[PDB]
Amino acid sequence: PEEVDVIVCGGGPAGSVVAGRLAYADPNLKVMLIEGGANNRDNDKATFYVDTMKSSHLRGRQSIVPCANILGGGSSINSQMYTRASASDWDDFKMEGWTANDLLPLMKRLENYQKPANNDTHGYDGPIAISNGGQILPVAQDFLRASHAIGIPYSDDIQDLKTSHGAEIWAKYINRHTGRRSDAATAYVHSVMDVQSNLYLRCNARVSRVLFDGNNKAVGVAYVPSRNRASNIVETVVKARKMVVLSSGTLGTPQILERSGVGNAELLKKLDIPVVSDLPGVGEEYQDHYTTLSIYRVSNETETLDEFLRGDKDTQRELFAEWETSPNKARLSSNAIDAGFKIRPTEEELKEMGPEFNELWDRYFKDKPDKPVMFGSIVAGAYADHTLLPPGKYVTMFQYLEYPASRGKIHIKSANPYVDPFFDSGFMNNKADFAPIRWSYKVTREVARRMDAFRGELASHHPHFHPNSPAATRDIDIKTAKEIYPNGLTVGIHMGTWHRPSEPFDPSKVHEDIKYTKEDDQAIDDWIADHVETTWHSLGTCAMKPREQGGVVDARLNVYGTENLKCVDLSICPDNLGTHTYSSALLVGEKGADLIAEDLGLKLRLPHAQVPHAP
Amino acid sequence: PEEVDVIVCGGGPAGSVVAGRLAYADPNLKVMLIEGGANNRDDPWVRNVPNDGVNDKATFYVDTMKSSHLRGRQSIVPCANILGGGSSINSQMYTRASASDWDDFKMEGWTANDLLPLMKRLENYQKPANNDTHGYDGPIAISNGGQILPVAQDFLRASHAIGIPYSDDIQDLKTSHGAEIWAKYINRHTGRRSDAATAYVHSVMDVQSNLYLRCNARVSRVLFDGNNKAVGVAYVPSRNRASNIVETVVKARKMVVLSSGTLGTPQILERSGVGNAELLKKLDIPVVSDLPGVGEEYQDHYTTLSIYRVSNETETLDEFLRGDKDTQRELSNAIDAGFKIRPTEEELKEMGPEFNELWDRYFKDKPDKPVMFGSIVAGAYADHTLLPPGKYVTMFQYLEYPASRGKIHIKSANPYVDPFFDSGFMNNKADFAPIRWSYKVTREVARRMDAFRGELASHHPHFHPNSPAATRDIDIKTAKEIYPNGLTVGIHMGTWHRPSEPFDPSKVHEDIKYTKEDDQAIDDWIADHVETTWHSLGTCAMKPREQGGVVDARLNVYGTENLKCVDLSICPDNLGTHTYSSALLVGEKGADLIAEDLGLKLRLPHAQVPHAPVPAGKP
Numbered sequence A: 001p002e003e004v005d006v007i008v009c010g011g012g013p014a015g016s017v018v019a020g021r022l023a024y025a026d027p028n029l030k031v032m033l034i035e036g037g038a039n040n041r042d043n044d045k046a047t048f049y050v051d052t053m054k055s056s057h058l059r060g061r062q063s064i065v066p067c068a069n070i071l072g073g074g075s076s077i078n079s080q081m082y083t084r085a086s087a088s089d090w091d092d093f094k095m096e097g098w099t100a101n102d103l104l105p106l107m108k109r110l111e112n113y114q115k116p117a118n119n120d121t122h123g124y125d126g127p128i129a130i131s132n133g134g135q136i137l138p139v140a141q142d143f144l145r146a147s148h149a150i151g152i153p154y155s156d157d158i159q160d161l162k163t164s165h166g167a168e169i170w171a172k173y174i175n176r177h178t179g180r181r182s183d184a185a186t187a188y189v190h191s192v193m194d195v196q197s198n199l200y201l202r203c204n205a206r207v208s209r210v211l212f213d214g215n216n217k218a219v220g221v222a223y224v225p226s227r228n229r230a231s232n233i234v235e236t237v238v239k240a241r242k243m244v245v246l247s248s249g250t251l252g253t254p255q256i257l258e259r260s261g262v263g264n265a266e267l268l269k270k271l272d273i274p275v276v277s278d279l280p281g282v283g284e285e286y287q288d289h290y291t292t293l294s295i296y297r298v299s300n301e302t303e304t305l306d307e308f309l310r311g312d313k314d315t316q317r318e319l320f321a322e323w324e325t326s327p328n329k330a331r332l333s334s335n336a337i338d339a340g341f342k343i344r345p346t347e348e349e350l351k352e353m354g355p356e357f358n359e360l361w362d363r364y365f366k367d368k369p370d371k372p373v374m375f376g377s378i379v380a381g382a383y384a385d386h387t388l389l390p391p392g393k394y395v396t397m398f399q400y401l402e403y404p405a406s407r408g409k410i411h412i413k414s415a416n417p418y419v420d421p422f423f424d425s426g427f428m429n430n431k432a433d434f435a436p437i438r439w440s441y442k443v444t445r446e447v448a449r450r451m452d453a454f455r456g457e458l459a460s461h462h463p464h465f466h467p468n469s470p471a472a473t474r475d476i477d478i479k480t481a482k483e484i485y486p487n488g489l490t491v492g493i494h495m496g497t498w499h500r501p502s503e504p505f506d507p508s509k510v511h512e513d514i515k516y517t518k519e520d521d522q523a524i525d526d527w528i529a530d531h532v533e534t535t536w537h538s539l540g541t542c543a544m545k546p547r548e549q550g551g552v553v554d555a556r557l558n559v560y561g562t563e564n565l566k567c568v569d570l571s572i573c574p575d576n577l578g579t580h581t582y583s584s585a586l587l588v589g590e591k592g593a594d595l596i597a598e599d600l601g602l603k604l605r606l607p608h609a610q611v612p613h614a615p
Numbered sequence B: 001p002e003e004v005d006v007i008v009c010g011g012g013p014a015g016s017v018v019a020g021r022l023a024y025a026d027p028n029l030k031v032m033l034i035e036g037g038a039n040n041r042d043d044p045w046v047r048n049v050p051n052d053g054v055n056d057k058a059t060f061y062v063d064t065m066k067s068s069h070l071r072g073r074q075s076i077v078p079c080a081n082i083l084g085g086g087s088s089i090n091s092q093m094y095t096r097a098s099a100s101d102w103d104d105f106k107m108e109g110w111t112a113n114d115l116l117p118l119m120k121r122l123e124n125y126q127k128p129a130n131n132d133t134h135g136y137d138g139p140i141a142i143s144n145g146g147q148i149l150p151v152a153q154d155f156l157r158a159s160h161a162i163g164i165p166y167s168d169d170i171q172d173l174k175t176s177h178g179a180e181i182w183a184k185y186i187n188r189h190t191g192r193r194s195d196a197a198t199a200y201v202h203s204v205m206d207v208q209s210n211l212y213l214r215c216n217a218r219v220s221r222v223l224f225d226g227n228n229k230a231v232g233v234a235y236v237p238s239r240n241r242a243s244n245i246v247e248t249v250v251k252a253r254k255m256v257v258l259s260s261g262t263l264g265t266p267q268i269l270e271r272s273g274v275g276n277a278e279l280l281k282k283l284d285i286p287v288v289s290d291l292p293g294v295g296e297e298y299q300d301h302y303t304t305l306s307i308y309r310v311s312n313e314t315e316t317l318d319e320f321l322r323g324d325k326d327t328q329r330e331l332s333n334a335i336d337a338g339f340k341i342r343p344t345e346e347e348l349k350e351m352g353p354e355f356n357e358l359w360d361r362y363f364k365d366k367p368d369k370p371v372m373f374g375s376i377v378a379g380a381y382a383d384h385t386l387l388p389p390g391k392y393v394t395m396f397q398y399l400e401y402p403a404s405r406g407k408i409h410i411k412s413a414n415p416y417v418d419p420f421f422d423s424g425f426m427n428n429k430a431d432f433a434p435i436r437w438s439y440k441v442t443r444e445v446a447r448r449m450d451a452f453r454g455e456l457a458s459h460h461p462h463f464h465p466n467s468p469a470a471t472r473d474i475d476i477k478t479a480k481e482i483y484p485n486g487l488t489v490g491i492h493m494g495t496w497h498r499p500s501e502p503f504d505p506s507k508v509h510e511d512i513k514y515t516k517e518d519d520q521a522i523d524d525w526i527a528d529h530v531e532t533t534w535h536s537l538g539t540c541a542m543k544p545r546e547q548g549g550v551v552d553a554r555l556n557v558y559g560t561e562n563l564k565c566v567d568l569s570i571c572p573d574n575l576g577t578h579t580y581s582s583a584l585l586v587g588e589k590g591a592d593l594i595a596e597d598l599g600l601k602l603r604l605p606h607a608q609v610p611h612a613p614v615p616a617g618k619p
Ligand SMILES: Cc1cc2nc3c(=O)[nH]c(=O)nc-3n(C[C@H](O)[C@H](O)[C@H](O)COP(=O)(O)OP(=O)(O)OC[C@H]3O[C@@H](n4cnc5c(N)ncnc54)[C@H](O)[C@@H]3O)c2cc1C
Pocket: A009, A010, A011, A012, A013, A014, A015, A034, A035, A036, A037, A066, A067, A068, A069, A070, A071, A072, A073, A074, A075, A077, A078, A079, A080, A081, A082, A083, A205, A206, A207, A208, A247, A248, A249, A250, A252, A253, A256, A535, A536, A537, A538, A569, A570, A571, A579, A580, A581, A582, A583, A585
């Protein structure tokens, strides 16, 4: 059509939630969802943002933040892990109607908890399927025992919005009955489109800008094809009688806004864009979660995912056969990340994390006991290029920083919707971020060394310690290297002294913590600098806070200085969230659905449409 | 027996030559050869030196103390522990020192031209020789192997490309800058490795009965009389199984000869009373002659290995070392080509004070001495349980005339206690500069090969990731062939690497530029990964006593009579060569000397070696 009641820009979890809830609320309400990626009903599935300028913090790297480019948003790109923020995280939006207790009903509204529940903070009549997957791999349980061994208590639920130090069997966004991944679009959008026809889906359309009024009321939206295949660039305009909603994700929305005339005035002046609203905060304060990976070598008897990732024929054939014939309990019906923890440093440990982190701590964490500092978890395999990986089997300690101090930004460089924006990831531009990440490298390491499967550290993919230091990396025992190439000459030739072998596995071993110097710390810092990467949990470019502090949206997610325009995706978060952020994006979407429901005098219909090929 | 004419301690190449030549000289002369290792007429049979517990063919000396020069490492120097000595535990390479090396012994009768007839006397050169420095009616059979692996031709082409000229012979005592197809210690007719014992000793025992051979016996010391004449030798079994140590003694009517190798002989001497007097007095060993040079000035060739990754179409030795595909059963030493190189005056300017001083004093006026050796191993000379999948080649490079010196000293009169040992690796800073230089050169060579498909980052210096000289690992195109449906190839997540640009034959090449911090990265890499080449020499120097010498110009231990050292330990300075040919030569000269000293005539040609047809006796 040319005119609809509500236009929602972007098919992320947020946009999908808004469009779905609203369209299902009233068959009269005509909403349209404009998405720049392909329809997912059935690489190029992500758009890649690169640091425009080399970062001095990352030792001359240009960090790359890829984000989703498909219907369903990030939820269509992986078998995802289930995590929720701590309650203080929302209570700290300091925004009316967004407190923990405010959002709790909604946290429940969107969940289909298929697990046994250790508390009363989950939901069951929601579209989004949450389960533990097929089966738990033994390495994970091993990880849990070692973790318990060093003071990380086992818990049956670490997502009760209150646990900050604990480990668990990590649940996944995968339906337990059918074994299919739970993206937001099929759960919220396609489910509706199959039973109603007032939800218009317009994919492969990159929203260029918002069309405004004389009184700055959102009147419509102009979109251009997703790829720039023509000599001329042509806008399709579609009007919105009631509401325009921007859900193009953290990297996506501030560009729409800035090229609509909403943003920093000085920039728009530089860019020949008529100014609609002066908001220097648009695109600023970019936040993320910083990932480091510690790769360790394990006994060959261990069940890991490596043959699959290398691509052996009979193993890929066997596992695909199994995920085909019995997805109910199939190992491939998992993300092979079956266990992890949220951890916090002890007042004893704090004494060694420096001025910078102690300031950040005293200020941010000290009074909020439910906020974790770090996340860690065990990947039954090596999350790295296997053509640079020695033969054998691995696990990976996947760890990320929960609430980084560093900030980045993204700003358009042209009014043209097809030009790359200026981007600064911001990774490590605040020194107070090295200290906790460093700590994790240590913590996880300890855990790895206490596992029944641990057979060594992968020297190359670990920090570059001074060889003579007690903290050096010890690689595989001769026994395991012998079982890897039994009839192989060369195993164990010391010629070159290319490694230092571990003493073989004596389960009757008592462990003493590795002692680290300042020099060793500097090695870990360099490693962190060299290899830290995004976690794809981008947020905060269109912050929700008072304008005078640099906000862009209302307590009702209305863009300041306009009417009928809302930003409801992850970009609105004023401060970071201690979680994998899909659950957050869904929650922000649900809240947004509520707000727009209120604004339009609408009553949401629940429960939602039956998700396709689902019970 | 309890009495023989000549006792020889150690069955190495030198010791084998002495025993064989003498026993064959006069059938009446009863000689006995005592070896601390096993007999080498093997049953089962480079991969011959790792401590697997299954290594009984080598003894491992470990640095008593950690080396600050080597960033806290204790270097490990393995030596041969078997009859034939080092010549029995590998597929051997043929190399000769340059003539300046011998001329510089400054010992009468050890000049290059003096020894040349001896050099020919031992060679059975079976490749065509386009010069006049080889022998043809000699025992040790030398050839070029069958055919050359393609990567070697590749390497040679690259070498020429950076100015290392091709030569048909690098072992003519005269070249210091050139490359060649490397010839080996293998008989071309029968395809068998020509170790020194089976060539010189076993040939005699098969035809005569006056050469007694005693294996598994560790010569503990020399028995001296009142005028410090060697009367015999005391030896113990080499496996210290017995609860008590009982010495077996055998007397010597004519001569005692010590040939137990560079790490072995100075110990015998020290437990005999010949050595640092303060030391022995500390060890309650009665002093026979104070010779502080004994056990001192240990020299070697320092090896570093550069591993580079190559294309999968390439034929290398790797699948073999991995053992896969029943190829170990189906199946040269796969080091078929290399070079001797010397730095150009322009390059000298970037090598620093220490080495430039060394250059002015040592190399400047002697144009035939190469500074570095390099060669290509068609496979990765490294632990494959630490190597990413795929195929590799490695630049095997060693320093020809190192400045560092180490030492070895007994720690007790007990023959079964490990001695104090210091490899000495890199304790003279003038040793870093050339190796680093070499690291650079080979890399360039490596970058210019048609098979080169990347550098193995892990095993290369730790260059700053952002430096232009950082290493770029395998290109994505090859990594794809390694795992066609592999879900992880080309994942950028982690930035653990920087991939190399894929192969276009029409590419023009520019030398890599290095900084001072990049130079330091390489100094640290060198310090971290430098290893011996098993070319140990010099612990019992041949020079005037007042300079710290131990032996005569005729190899007699100072302060005694009827005692000689005939092995590599007598070399006063290093030799720009793999040292087997050198060890054989020392042996021949010693045999000659002992021949004159006892009024004997060597019988030439030698006893016919087992498993050979009649020797050609002409090109
Ligand atoms: C590989 C990957 C793995 C992830 N794994 C997890 C996990 O395991 N657990 C977890 O909790 N979270 C995970 N996430 C993140 C999670 O998906 C996001 O945080 C969540 O989806 C946020 O939703 P969003 O709506 O805010 O942004 P998005 O989901 O990114 O929404 C982006 C959508 O809007 C489209 N769009 C963008 N720009 C425009 C434009 N100008 N015009 C029109 N449309 C546009 C986008 O192309 C896309 O369709 C992962 C993300 C990635 C990339």
